[PDB]
């Protein structure tokens, strides 16, 4: 055999899902340059953006033709169910938990501390015998 280690990059291709502004999802519909792409999405405005302003996700929207219009992008996004695919990843889960933590109140933080005390007691009890 050969056993060549290949790069696991994310590629700039028609159908790549990207995060914009740490809030919204979008997909690449056509490549402008090494630096610029045309993006579209159900909850975003179809626009030409610089690749520095977006982050490629490991997700590809399969079978998206180059230059697809807003209707095609929305229809294929609904078919591929990109929102559910995103929401199941540890990245989106970490973002959601960060938001949830940011919405806690002082009383909820106090309760968090109390629950941490109880769980640490249980964890030490489990750890000493295992």
């Amino acid at each position: 055999s050969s056993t060549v280690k290949a790069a696991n990059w994310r590629f700039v291709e028609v159908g790549r899902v990207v995060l914009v502004d740490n809030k919204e999802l979008a997909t690449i519909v056509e490549i402008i340059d090494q630096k610029r792409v045309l993006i579209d999405g159900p909850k975003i405005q179809r626009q030409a953006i610089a690749l520095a302003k977006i982050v490629l996700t490991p997700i590809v929207l399969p079978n998206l033709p180059r230059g697809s219009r807003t209707a095609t992008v929305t229809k294929k996004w609904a078919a591929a169910d990109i929102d559910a695919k995103w929401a199941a990843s540890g990245w989106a889960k970490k973002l959601a938990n960060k938001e949830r933590r940011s919405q806690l109140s002082d009383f909820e933080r106090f309760q968090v501390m109390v629950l941490k005390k109880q769980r640490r007691f249980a964890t030490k009890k489990a750890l000493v015998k295992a």
């Binding site: 938990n97 960060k98 949830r100 909820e108 629950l115 941490k116 249980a122 489990a126 750890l127 295992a130």
Partner: protein, 199 residues
């Protein structure tokens, strides 16, 4: 952005002047800084150019008495110190106090061999230079200009890394055991409540 009692920076892979300016402004603002592994610092530009630059620096000396002139320090830590001091009003009492807030070393001597070293992304060579550019390691320039203890430092750094590797293997084993204990106490009332809170 937090204020730390001491910030210990691992100097490996850092560009000399960007780290120097950042550390100067940090110590001027009352922050204590320790820089370790100054022999692993980086300067942009090929090695020969920096050797020529250091020889231009060496050219400069007080004519009537060489003992009064610039003192060309050959150690990597002293090169970083010169870079920083050029960025400080060192002839005032305030600059003197700011410089007292700073320490620079070759290698990682005690007690810092068992403490946390951080990096400075705004000054990292691997993140700043274009991927084709050539760079210099300050340890090789120092040996090339008179620093005598390169092989002593590399012998002691290999010894430190052997001990530091044993540390990590112990920490990974105890981290694995605690995770198995945290897995047992999962799906408990505290864990379910902590999951609704985001923890």
């Amino acid at each position: 952005s937090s204020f730390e009692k001491v910030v210990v920076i691992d100097g490996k892979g850092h560009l000399l002047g960007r780290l120097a300016s950042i550390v100067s402004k940090q110590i001027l603002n009352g922050q204590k800084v320790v820089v370790v592994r100054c022999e692993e610092l980086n300067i942009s530009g090929e090695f020969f150019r920096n050797k020529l630059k250091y020889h231009d620096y060496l050219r400069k000396a007080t004519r009537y008495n060489k003992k009064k002139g610039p003192f060309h320090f050959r150690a990597p830590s002293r090169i970083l110190y010169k870079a920083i001091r050029g960025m400080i009003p060192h002839k005032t009492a305030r600059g003197k106090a700011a410089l007292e807030r700073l320490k620079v070393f070759e290698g990682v001597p005690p007690p810092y061999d068992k403490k946390k070293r951080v990096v400075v992304p705004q000054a990292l060579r691997v993140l700043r230079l274009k991927p084709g550019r050539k760079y210099t390691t300050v340890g090789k320039l120092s040996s090339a200009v008179g620093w005598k203890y390169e092989s002593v430092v590399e012998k002691l750094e290999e010894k430190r890394k052997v001990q530091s590797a044993e540390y990590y293997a112990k920490k990974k084993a105890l981290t694995k055991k605690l995770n198995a204990a945290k897995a047992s106490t999962a799906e408990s009332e505290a864990a379910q409540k902590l999951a609704a809170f985001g923890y």
